[PDB]
Design a binder for this molecule. Structure first.
Ligand SMILES: [Ca+2]
Ligand SMILES: [Ca+2]
Ligand SMILES: [Ca+2]
Ligand SMILES: [Ca+2]
Ligand SMILES: [Ca+2]
Ligand SMILES: [Ca+2]
Ligand SMILES: [Ca+2]
Ligand SMILES: [Ca+2]
Ligand SMILES: [Ca+2]
Ligand SMILES: [Ca+2]
Ligand SMILES: [Ca+2]
Ligand SMILES: [Ca+2]
Ligand SMILES: [Ca+2]
Ligand SMILES: [Ca+2]
Lengths: 214, 214
């Protein structure tokens, strides 16, 4: 052809229909004799078996089911070409398959509860703590794995509500009001959120507990 | 995003419509201020100017016309992000565009006429000469640039016709008949052909003149 194929990029979670054609393998010895094609490697003849196949007669490389980037992100397979008289007519061909991302993981907070303390007299603008959520999707080329933080809600609501903020990118929680008074309200429970696609995607929650120190 | 884009592969001779969107550039400083996008490089702001553009407000990278791999096979552009107050908010982003092939060149013989001579007594199977045609299209991953040779016709047709063959891949012309006789027919003119897609594509012609030596 030459007996080569460029790396193939396949987005995960393809709709099909399956089996899906990716590339047609072909040995120029098929002018001379009938060629039988086959494939080996993890994803073909070793676990996960049968994700990919090749059609014996035609050389079509097929994907049999949708892929999942977070299970396996890249496959390295080998294609074979054998004459009808049983002789290999090519050295095995390196077939590289790269699985590209879709946004299919929700963020996950690293803790169900995060705790931080401040002195009663801290001024507005004071950083209390930094929370974190991870996201298994790509955050280099897209926002699939990019988390935006927000505050869902605060209890109690004394001396008033929305006394805290969270930095949309860093997860740093700050107090933005005056009026902390430990003798009145010694602790606040914040329900916090993390949302992928930098705020447009899906959202998980955790708790941040703010202790007013004595 | 990060302020990066993976290389973009675009087949030549795209149907459009144009302008065609390729990728949306985006700086995360647009949470903070309005961003104006722009592009530089050969193919954008230097020859060939205006092949690619970027939409100021949206950051969409556009292709303005179909590409031709044999004119330019790869572009290296730079994307820019500038705040409404005039400050650059990113270092320029490397944008790599790779133009991939379609079969749009016919083969071209290297000579309009090729000449070879043989002794009258050469046996069937004798190689007379080797002709060549080139093809500017890809011959690594496809047959776009892969030439199949054939004989179009022979004059004169004495002592009979189809006295010669040509090797489909090498362009080696051979005599396959007995009966060469210089005193009867001292020279044969062969119209020869070269066809891309290894025989399925389009076809050019040349002349091969076979001299029977004394
Ligand atoms: Ca997945
Ligand atoms: Ca995994
Ligand atoms: Ca994913
Ligand atoms: Ca995600
Ligand atoms: Ca005080
Ligand atoms: Ca006090
Ligand atoms: Ca005290
Ligand atoms: Ca072209
Ligand atoms: Ca050129
Ligand atoms: Ca071409
Ligand atoms: Ca061609
Ligand atoms: Ca003789
Ligand atoms: Ca003789
Ligand atoms: Ca003589």
């Amino acid at each position: 052809m030459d007996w080569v194929v460029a790396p193939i990029s396949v987005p995960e979670n393809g709709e099909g229909p399956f089996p899906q054609r990716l590339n047609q393998l072909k040995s120029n010895k098929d002018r001379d004799t009938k060629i039988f094609y086959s494939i080996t490697g993890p994803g073909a003849d070793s676990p996960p078996e049968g994700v990919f196949a090749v059609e014996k007669e035609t050389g079509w490389l097929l994907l049999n089911k949708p892929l999942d980037r977070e299970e396996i992100a890249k496959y390295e397979l080998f294609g074979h070409a054998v004459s009808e008289n049983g002789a290999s007519v090519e050295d095995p061909m390196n077939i590289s398959i790269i699985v590209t991302d879709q946004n299919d993981h929700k963020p996950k907070f690293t803790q169900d509860t995060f705790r931080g303390s401040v002195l009663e007299g801290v001024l507005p603008g004071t950083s209390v703590m930094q929370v974190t959520a991870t996201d298994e999707d790509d955050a280099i080329y897209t926002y699939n794995g990019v988390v935006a933080y927000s505050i869902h809600s605060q209890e109690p609501k004394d001396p008033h509500d929305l006394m805290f903020t969270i930095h949309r990118s860093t997860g740093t929680i700050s107090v933005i009001s005056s009026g902390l008074d430990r003798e009145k309200v010694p602790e606040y429970t914040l329900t916090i959120q993390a949302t992928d696609m930098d705020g447009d995607g899906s959202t998980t929650t955790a708790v941040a507990v703010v202790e007013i120190l004595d």
